[PDB]
Design a protein around this motif. Structure first.
Motif, PDB file in Angstrom:
ATOM      1  N   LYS A  21     -28.512 -39.312   6.548  1.00 54.02           N
ATOM      2  CA  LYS A  21     -27.688 -39.792   5.450  1.00 54.02           C
ATOM      3  C   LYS A  21     -26.451 -40.508   5.965  1.00 54.02           C
ATOM      4  CE  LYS A  21     -28.829 -36.667   1.642  1.00 54.02           C
ATOM      5  NZ  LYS A  21     -28.337 -36.542   0.235  1.00 54.02           N
ATOM      6  N   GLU A  22     -26.195 -40.420   7.263  1.00 52.71           N
ATOM      7  CA  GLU A  22     -25.054 -41.102   7.830  1.00 52.71           C
ATOM      8  C   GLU A  22     -25.152 -41.382   9.353  1.00 52.71           C
ATOM      9  OE1 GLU A  22     -25.229 -37.106   7.434  1.00 52.71           O
ATOM     10  OE2 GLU A  22     -23.966 -37.896   5.793  1.00 52.71           O
ATOM     11  N   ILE A  23     -24.503 -42.478   9.787  1.00 50.13           N
ATOM     12  CA  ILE A  23     -24.354 -42.831  11.217  1.00 50.13           C
ATOM     13  C   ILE A  23     -22.985 -43.414  11.502  1.00 50.13           C
ATOM     14  CG2 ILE A  23     -26.335 -43.373  12.729  1.00 50.13           C
ATOM     15  CD1 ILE A  23     -25.105 -45.504   9.732  1.00 50.13           C
ATOM     16  N   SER A  24     -22.544 -43.293  12.739  1.00 48.93           N
ATOM     17  CA  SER A  24     -21.363 -43.975  13.149  1.00 48.93           C
ATOM     18  C   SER A  24     -21.855 -45.229  13.815  1.00 48.93           C
ATOM     19  CB  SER A  24     -20.548 -43.138  14.130  1.00 48.93           C
ATOM     20  OG  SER A  24     -21.376 -42.719  15.177  1.00 48.93           O
ATOM     21  N   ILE A  25     -21.024 -46.258  13.724  1.00 45.27           N
ATOM     22  CA  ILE A  25     -21.234 -47.477  14.465  1.00 45.27           C
ATOM     23  C   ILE A  25     -21.459 -47.167  15.902  1.00 45.27           C
ATOM     24  CG2 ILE A  25     -20.224 -49.648  15.279  1.00 45.27           C
ATOM     25  CD1 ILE A  25     -20.837 -49.367  12.192  1.00 45.27           C
ATOM     26  N   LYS A  49     -13.811 -45.056   1.279  1.00 49.21           N
ATOM     27  CA  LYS A  49     -14.628 -45.147   2.503  1.00 49.21           C
ATOM     28  C   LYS A  49     -15.682 -46.273   2.491  1.00 49.21           C
ATOM     29  CE  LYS A  49     -14.743 -44.128   6.782  1.00 49.21           C
ATOM     30  NZ  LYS A  49     -14.383 -45.398   7.510  1.00 49.21           N
ATOM     31  N   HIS A  50     -16.091 -46.639   3.695  1.00 50.15           N
ATOM     32  CA  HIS A  50     -17.169 -47.602   3.888  1.00 50.15           C
ATOM     33  C   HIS A  50     -18.565 -46.990   3.959  1.00 50.15           C
ATOM     34  CE1 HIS A  50     -13.458 -49.539   5.311  1.00 50.15           C
ATOM     35  NE2 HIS A  50     -13.940 -50.482   4.525  1.00 50.15           N
ATOM     36  N   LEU A  51     -19.485 -47.662   3.280  1.00 57.33           N
ATOM     37  CA  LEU A  51     -20.868 -47.274   3.259  1.00 57.33           C
ATOM     38  C   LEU A  51     -21.757 -48.345   3.893  1.00 57.33           C
ATOM     39  CD1 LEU A  51     -19.242 -46.339   0.464  1.00 57.33           C
ATOM     40  CD2 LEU A  51     -21.432 -45.294   0.085  1.00 57.33           C
ATOM     41  N   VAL A  52     -22.893 -47.924   4.435  1.00 55.74           N
ATOM     42  CA  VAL A  52     -23.917 -48.857   4.869  1.00 55.74           C
ATOM     43  C   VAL A  52     -24.972 -48.938   3.788  1.00 55.74           C
ATOM     44  CG1 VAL A  52     -25.785 -49.338   6.467  1.00 55.74           C
ATOM     45  CG2 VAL A  52     -23.644 -48.278   7.316  1.00 55.74           C
ATOM     46  N   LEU A  53     -25.247 -50.142   3.296  1.00 59.96           N
ATOM     47  CA  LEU A  53     -26.278 -50.376   2.290  1.00 59.96           C
ATOM     48  C   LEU A  53     -27.608 -50.679   2.931  1.00 59.96           C
ATOM     49  CD1 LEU A  53     -27.324 -50.924  -0.501  1.00 59.96           C
ATOM     50  CD2 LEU A  53     -26.492 -53.303  -0.321  1.00 59.96           C
ATOM     51  N   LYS A  54     -28.606 -49.845   2.685  1.00 56.38           N
ATOM     52  CA  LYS A  54     -29.932 -50.040   3.268  1.00 56.38           C
ATOM     53  C   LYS A  54     -30.737 -51.063   2.462  1.00 56.38           C
ATOM     54  CE  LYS A  54     -33.108 -47.183   4.936  1.00 56.38           C
ATOM     55  NZ  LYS A  54     -33.820 -46.050   5.589  1.00 56.38           N
ATOM     56  N   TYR A  80     -17.692 -51.155   0.278  1.00 53.51           N
ATOM     57  CA  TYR A  80     -16.494 -50.328   0.194  1.00 53.51           C
ATOM     58  C   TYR A  80     -16.456 -49.427  -0.994  1.00 53.51           C
ATOM     59  CZ  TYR A  80     -11.841 -48.867   0.982  1.00 53.51           C
ATOM     60  OH  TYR A  80     -10.745 -48.122   1.298  1.00 53.51           O
ATOM     61  N   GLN A 108     -21.914 -56.981   8.205  1.00 53.57           N
ATOM     62  CA  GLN A 108     -21.190 -57.912   7.315  1.00 53.57           C
ATOM     63  C   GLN A 108     -21.945 -59.218   7.076  1.00 53.57           C
ATOM     64  OE1 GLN A 108     -18.697 -57.124   5.354  1.00 53.57           O
ATOM     65  NE2 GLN A 108     -19.513 -59.068   4.563  1.00 53.57           N
ATOM     66  N   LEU A 145     -22.303 -53.876   4.767  1.00 50.74           N
ATOM     67  CA  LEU A 145     -21.054 -53.127   4.653  1.00 50.74           C
ATOM     68  C   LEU A 145     -20.430 -53.229   3.250  1.00 50.74           C
ATOM     69  CD1 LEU A 145     -19.391 -53.304   8.091  1.00 50.74           C
ATOM     70  CD2 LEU A 145     -19.749 -51.230   6.722  1.00 50.74           C
ATOM     71  N   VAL A 182     -20.770 -54.233  13.599  1.00 53.52           N
ATOM     72  CA  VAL A 182     -20.000 -54.390  12.339  1.00 53.52           C
ATOM     73  C   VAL A 182     -20.138 -55.816  11.836  1.00 53.52           C
ATOM     74  CG1 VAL A 182     -17.665 -54.377  11.313  1.00 53.52           C
ATOM     75  CG2 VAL A 182     -18.313 -52.592  12.969  1.00 53.52           C
TER      76      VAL A 182
END
Ligand code: ACO
Ligand code: ZN
Lengths: 24, 265
Positions: free
Chosen positions: B202-206, B236-241, B232, B225, B230, B221
């Motif tokens: 459900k989550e990852i770091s760059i 917080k920032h989310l990654v959109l799959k 907002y 973009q 990416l 990043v």
């Protein structure tokens, strides 16, 4: 940290914080 | 001045001036040995040279092999003259190459294709032995005859594969030419969409993604973009799959890591 622009807005994001992977 | 070069069975138009001796640089055409990269004034000279020349591939060590496709690691201290010729050759198709004469601090990764006459040059990239900036490519080029067939991508991929195996992350040396940028975007997008396809959390770091691909966070990043992935929110920032994109993303134009045999020099 790293800077850029999204939907007409300035943003700043961590490269260590976990980011919610999301869909809709 | 130099408009054309004979290279093996190809006759290639040059894009840019390159500083060969004016002895040679005043000719229109330039005759190159495709195996050792000696440059010459005439066909008939080239012809006598091919009768004497024992080389059928680049010096150094062969660190990748998958059938007809190889990569050789050439040390610019050990093969100063071959690497210089290759830098001169490359300036014909780069707007700006930082360095020609001094190839000692570089390793050169020369990709080739073998046929019954020998291992033919498809392209190369150069690497600083010791980069203060952790650049894993200085200059990269696929030869004109081979452009737009997927080779540049294999080269780029192979650069980040060396990075994985050294336990470093890397990036190409700034500034990127425009074809360089187009090529690195396509690569990075692919690395990213591949990653997310295989990732189930459900989550990852760059940083995690960088540690796994050897791609630089800013490059990640930057690509997210470009992909408008990416987003907002809250604060917080989310990654959109983007599944449209991942399934968009789904001829043997790949580098297979089990076909690498390498120790960092
Ligand atoms: C840090 C540096 O060294 S920057 C300097 C980079 N070097 C140069 O500019 C030298 C001249 N350029 C080159 O030698 C080549 O263009 C390279 C090495 C950048 C790319 O090599 P190629 O083998 O043609 O790349 P490849 O076939 O893998 O394609 C890479 C991507 O770029 C695209 N591409 C390649 N050339 C072009 C082009 N002329 N116009 C539009 N797209 C192109 C391809 O469509 C592909 O992307 P896609 O998969 O998303 O369709
Ligand atoms: Zn030769």
């Amino acid at each position: 940290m790293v800077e850029i622009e999204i939907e007409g807005r300035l943003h700043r994001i961590s490269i260590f914080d976990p980011l919610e992977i999301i869909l809709e | 001045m130099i408009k054309t070069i004979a290279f093996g069975r190809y006759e290639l138009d040059t894009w840019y001036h390159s500083p060969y001796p004016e002895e040679y640089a005043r000719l229109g055409r330039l005759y190159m040995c495709e195996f050792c990269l000696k440059y010459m004034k005439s066909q008939t000279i080239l012809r006598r040279h091919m009768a004497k020349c024992v080389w059928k591939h680049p010096p150094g060590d062969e660190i990748y092999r998958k059938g007809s496709i190889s990569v050789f690691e050439v040390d610019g201290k050990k093969n100063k003259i071959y690497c210089q010729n290759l830098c001169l050759l490359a300036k014909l198709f780069l707007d700006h190459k930082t360095l020609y004469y001094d190839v000692e601090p570089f390793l050169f990764y020369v990709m080739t294709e073998a046929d019954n006459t020998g291992c033919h040059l498809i392209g190369y990239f150069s690497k600083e032995k010791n980069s203060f900036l952790n650049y894993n490519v200085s200059c990269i080029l696929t030869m004109p005859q081979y452009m737009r067939q997927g080779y540049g991508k294999m080269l780029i991929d192979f650069s980040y594969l060396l990075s994985k195996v050294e336990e470093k992350v890397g990036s190409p040396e700034r500034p990127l030419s425009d074809l360089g940028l187009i090529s690195y975007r396509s690569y990075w997008k692919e690395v990213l969409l591949r990653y997310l396809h295989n990732f189930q959390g459900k989550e990852i770091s760059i940083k995690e993604i960088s540690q796994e691909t050897a791609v630089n966070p800013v490059d990640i990043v930057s690509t997210l973009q470009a992909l408008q992935m990416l987003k907002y929110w809250k604060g917080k920032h989310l990654v959109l799959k983007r599944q449209d994109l991942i399934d968009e993303w789904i001829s043997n134009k790949t580098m297979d890591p089990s076909c690498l045999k390498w120790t960092p020099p």
